[PDB]
């Protein structure tokens, strides 16, 4: 009971923790995206890749960002994910100095991104990982490998999902398996699915507490 008690609690205090997760990480895909639009498109005008480097490398704002999601998920978060950040800061540090192509940093920032989005899974992965409780492990495998799926297809849209999804779940909302998107992704029903599939679980934890 103990046990049980102390698995929900640590799933609920991060999901907590980590509410505005995608919101934040849209907001870093909002401000870099003109930016990384142009690096990827005039790398053809010169004047154009130096001022969207120079978007991302202002005042560090962007890497700092990055830095406050991992700060988020210190405790569970991958041990990848700091060298990942770092490295984006390094390259972004080597265009600005050394002044034409800046394709590399606009690739770096991308797998970061999806990285930062996967570190979340991560961290839930390693929670659920805990429980005592069978039904709800083997939902939580289904769901992150749905969810890594649902990833790959589309990183923003996926953490939007899971963040909603087990938002919902902790806070005793029924899950929708209705697709918000008119099911133009073809990967968001079945993580759907199995987030309804944890949820069935997790409520049997609950409503034996």
């Given at each position: 009971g103990r046990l049980n008690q102390r698995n929900i609690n640590e799933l609920k205090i991060f999901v907590e923790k980590a509410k505005y997760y995608s919101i934040k990480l849209d907001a870093i895909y909002n401000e870099c995206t003109g930016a990384y639009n142009d690096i990827m498109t005039y790398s053809s005008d010169q004047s154009k890749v130096n001022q969207a480097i120079s978007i991302f490398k202002k005042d560090n704002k962007i890497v700092n960002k990055f830095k406050e999601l991992e700060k988020i998920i210190e405790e569970y978060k991958p041990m990848f994910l700091s060298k990942l950040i770092d490295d984006f800061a390094i390259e972004l540090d080597q265009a600005v100095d050394n002044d034409s192509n800046a394709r590399h940093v606009a690739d770096s920032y991308k797998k970061l991104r999806k990285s930062v989005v996967l570190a979340y899974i991560e961290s839930f992965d390693v929670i659920s990982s805990k429980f005592v409780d069978s039904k709800f492990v083997e939902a939580s495998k289904k769901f992150v490998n749905k969810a890594k799926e649902f990833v790959e297809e589309n990183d923003l849209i996926a953490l939007e999902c899971i963040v909603k999804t087990i938002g919902d779940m902790v806070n005793d909302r029924e899950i929708n398996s209705r697709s918000r998107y008119n099911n133009?992704?073809?990967?968001e029903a079945d993580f759907l699915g199995a987030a309804v599939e944890l949820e069935g679980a997790y409520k049997a934890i609950k409503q034996t507490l």
């Amino acid at each position: 009971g103990r046990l049980n008690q102390r698995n929900i609690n640590e799933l609920k205090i991060f999901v907590e923790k980590a509410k505005y997760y995608s919101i934040k990480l849209d907001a870093i895909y909002n401000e870099c995206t003109g930016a990384y639009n142009d690096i990827m498109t005039y790398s053809s005008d010169q004047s154009k890749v130096n001022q969207a480097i120079s978007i991302f490398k202002k005042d560090n704002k962007i890497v700092n960002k990055f830095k406050e999601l991992e700060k988020i998920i210190e405790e569970y978060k991958p041990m990848f994910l700091s060298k990942l950040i770092d490295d984006f800061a390094i390259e972004l540090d080597q265009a600005v100095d050394n002044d034409s192509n800046a394709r590399h940093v606009a690739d770096s920032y991308k797998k970061l991104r999806k990285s930062v989005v996967l570190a979340y899974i991560e961290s839930f992965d390693v929670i659920s990982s805990k429980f005592v409780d069978s039904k709800f492990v083997e939902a939580s495998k289904k769901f992150v490998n749905k969810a890594k799926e649902f990833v790959e297809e589309n990183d923003l849209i996926a953490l939007e999902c899971i963040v909603k999804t087990i938002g919902d779940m902790v806070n005793d909302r029924e899950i929708n398996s209705r697709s918000r998107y008119n099911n133009f992704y073809k990967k968001e029903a079945d993580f759907l699915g199995a987030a309804v599939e944890l949820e069935g679980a997790y409520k049997a934890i609950k409503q034996t507490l």
